[PDB]
Ligand binder design. Structure first.
Ligand code: A1BS6
Ligand code: ZN
Length: 139
């Protein structure tokens, strides 16, 4: 689990969104596994606006942060789950690292701010849903 709080928005994995996220829906994209809902309280996370490929992510299955090199946002095949059939997930970035399903929502950050959230795992790889292109998150 985990979310990003920026302004009047909450960003979560679409497969983990609550009834409240759906009742206050702003935008959702199944191909990206992202959902954004509106909040009453003001969020203070800074979203990065960069092309960084190095950062640090939070891994809850290890209670630890790990430094990683990650790929550029791209369309990558993701195996079937209780949430989606087998498909290409867009805007996905991979890194060599530890991830379990419960790790989804852990934030990836660079020196410029929040890059994205854990969205896939397995085989000694971790996938992050990128959020840096969502320029409207700030306005
Ligand atoms: N973005 C998606 O489609 C997600 C939906 C939830 C499930 N997603 C996963 O990748 N699960 C997963 C499977 C694993 C694993 C780690 C993870 Cl995070 O290690 C053993 O098997 C895809
Ligand atoms: Zn950066």
């Amino acid at each position: 689990s985990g979310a990003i709080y920026v302004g009047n928005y909450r960003v979560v994995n679409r497969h983990l969104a609550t009834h409240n996220d759906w009742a206050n829906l702003v935008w959702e994209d199944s191909s990206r596994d992202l959902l954004v809902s509106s909040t009453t309280a003001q969020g203070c996370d800074t979203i990065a606006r960069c092309d960084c490929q190095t950062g640090v992510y939070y891994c809850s299955s290890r209670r630890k942060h790990y430094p990683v090199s990650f790929s550029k946002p791209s369309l990558i095949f993701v195996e079937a789950s209780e949430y989606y059939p087998a498909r290409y997930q867009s805007h996905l970035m991979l890194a060599v690292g530890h991830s379990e399903p419960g790790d989804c929502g852990g934030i990836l950050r660079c020196q410029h701010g929040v890059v994205g959230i854990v969205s896939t795992g397995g085989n000694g790889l971790v996938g992050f849903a990128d959020v840096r292109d969502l320029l409207w998150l700030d306005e």
